[PDB]
Amino acid sequence: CGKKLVT
Amino acid sequence: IVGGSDSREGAWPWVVALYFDDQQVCGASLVSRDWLVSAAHCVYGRNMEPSKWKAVLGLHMASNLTSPQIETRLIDQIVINPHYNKRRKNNDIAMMHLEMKVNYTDYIQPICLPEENQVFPPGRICSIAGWGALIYQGSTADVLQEADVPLLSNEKCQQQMPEYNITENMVCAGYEAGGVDSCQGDSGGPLMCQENNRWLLAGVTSFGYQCALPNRPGVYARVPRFTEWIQSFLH
Amino acid sequence: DDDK
Ligand SMILES: [Zn+2]
Ligand SMILES: [Zn+2]
């Protein structure tokens, strides 16, 4: 939820 | 988005593109495996035949739908906010159900929903994103545009927007000198604020006098004021 | 209109 997951 | 910059893949995994009859016309935000929050004027007068709408997730370049991280879904149902008022541009928000669920990946994630009384004070810097016009009445973008904008107080927004009725269901953002703002083609898209590592859906690009003009802030539907109505659909 |  609401978190970016790409470096 | 005007005055923004090209975002890279995965930057905003909850931002989704909407196509009406295979024509990209608005943005929306993923909030579950089944629902999207967007703007009512996007689907107004063309909500009765929902399968005519396409939701493209994990999208990056509008000119490139070949990327493997993308997923497409037809729209099963469109639920316009019961109090939407085209004349008043008030309550410009709407739910859209995906006929089939999506699978959460690193490029497709739901944005957090704000608390009902989540305060968004002026000076607070937030982000807008979309594929809309790069300048007023100009061409839309290819690479997903992103931009940071400071929030205003409704009092101050009403001030610069006397020709409209800034209701408590709206929230505005923009620079006094202009330059950065949401434009045509961005409606339905989010206005997000990071609250401690987590991004919250603050607003929904709704309307405004032109774009990027000084002392002419972009208006958005204030999500905290609809947070319960939205969460009721969740599933 | 002014709508986005
Ligand atoms: Zn309540
Ligand atoms: Zn469901």
Nearest listed ligand to the Cα of residue B100: 2
Which are the contacts of B142, defined by CB distance < 8 A and separation ≥ 6?
B61, B62, B63, B131
Q: How many folded domains does chain B comprise?
A: 2
Closest among B223, B143, B168 to B190, alpha carbons compared: B223
B74-82: long-range contacts at Cβ-Cβ below 8 A with a sequence spacing of 24 or more? B74/B50, B74/B98, B74/B99, B74/B100, B75/B50, B75/B51, B75/B99, B76/B50, B76/B51, B77/B50, B78/B43, B78/B47, B78/B50, B78/B53, B79/B233, B80/B40, B80/B43, B80/B44, B80/B47, B81/B40, B81/B226, B81/B229
Between CA B219 and CA B225 the distance in angstroms is 14
Chain C closest-CA separation from residue B182 CA (Å): 8
Closest among B185, B212, B223 to B93, alpha carbons compared: B223
Instruction: Specify whether the CB–CB gap between B182 and C4 falls below 8 A.
Output: yes
Instruction: Say whether both B168 and B235 belong to one domain.
Output: no
DSSP state of B196: T
Instruction: Say whether both B128 and B147 belong to one domain.
Output: yes
- The two three-digit tokens of residue B26, written as one number: 């608005």
Question: Which residues of B are catalytically annotated?
Answer: 41, 92, 187
Q: Which residue spans within B66-139 are E strands per DSSP? A: 71-80, 94-98, 125-130
The CATH code of the domain that includes B150 is 2.40.10.10
Instruction: Say whether both B104 and B18 belong to one domain.
Output: yes
Segment (H or E) for B160: helix B154-160
Please give the backbone phi and psi of residue B223, each rounded to the nearest 5 degrees, phi first.
Answer: -55, -35
Between CA B180 and CA B176 the distance in angstroms is 10
Segments forming the whole domain that contains residue B232: 13-110+225-235
Instruction: Say whether both B174 and B196 belong to one domain.
Output: yes
- Tell me how long chain A is: 7
Chain B residue with Cα closest to A5: B106
Distance B226 CA to ligand 1 centre (A): 8
Task: Answer yes or no: do A6 and B107 touch at CB < 8 A.
Answer: yes
Instruction: Say whether both B115 and B2 belong to one domain.
Output: yes
B155, exposed or middle or buried, with CB in 10 Å at 0-12, 13-18, 19+? exposed
Give the three-state DSSP class for B33: coil
Instruction: Specify whether the CB–CB gap between B17 and B25 falls below 8 A.
Output: no
Instruction: Say whether both B71 and B158 belong to one domain.
Output: no
Instruction: Say whether both B39 and B125 belong to one domain.
Output: no
Give the three-state DSSP class for B133: strand
DSSP state of B198: E
Q: What is the DSSP string of B144-156?
A: PEEEEEEB--HHH
DSSP state of B110: P
Find the farthest-apart pair of alpha carbons in chain A and give their distance in angstroms, rounded: 17
What's the sign of the alpha-carbon dihedral B234, B115, B197, B8?
A: positive
AA identity, residue B66 = T
Instruction: Please list, residue by residue across A1-7, b when 16 or more beta carbons sit within 10 angstroms of its beta carbon and e when fewer do.
Output: ebeeeee
Instruction: Say whether both B121 and B86 belong to one domain.
Output: no
Instruction: Say whether both B92 and B119 belong to one domain.
Output: no
Which are the contacts of B102, defined by CB distance < 8 A and separation ≥ 6?
B30, B33, B57, B71, B73, B108
Can you say whether residue B197 is alpha, beta or left, with left for phi > 0 and alpha for psi between -120 and 50 degrees? left
Find the farthest-apart pair of alpha carbons in chain B and give their distance in angstroms, rounded: 47
CB-based contact, B92 to chain C, within 8 Å: yes
Between CA B21 and CA B228 the distance in angstroms is 31
Which are the contacts of B214, defined by CB distance < 8 A and separation ≥ 6?
B175, B176, B177, B178, B179
Residue of B33, B59, B199, B201 for testing the chain A interface, max A β-carbons within 10 Å: B199
Task: Answer yes or no: do A2 and B111 touch at CB < 8 A.
Answer: yes
Instruction: Say whether both B194 and B119 belong to one domain.
Output: yes
Between CA B207 and CA B87 the distance in angstroms is 12
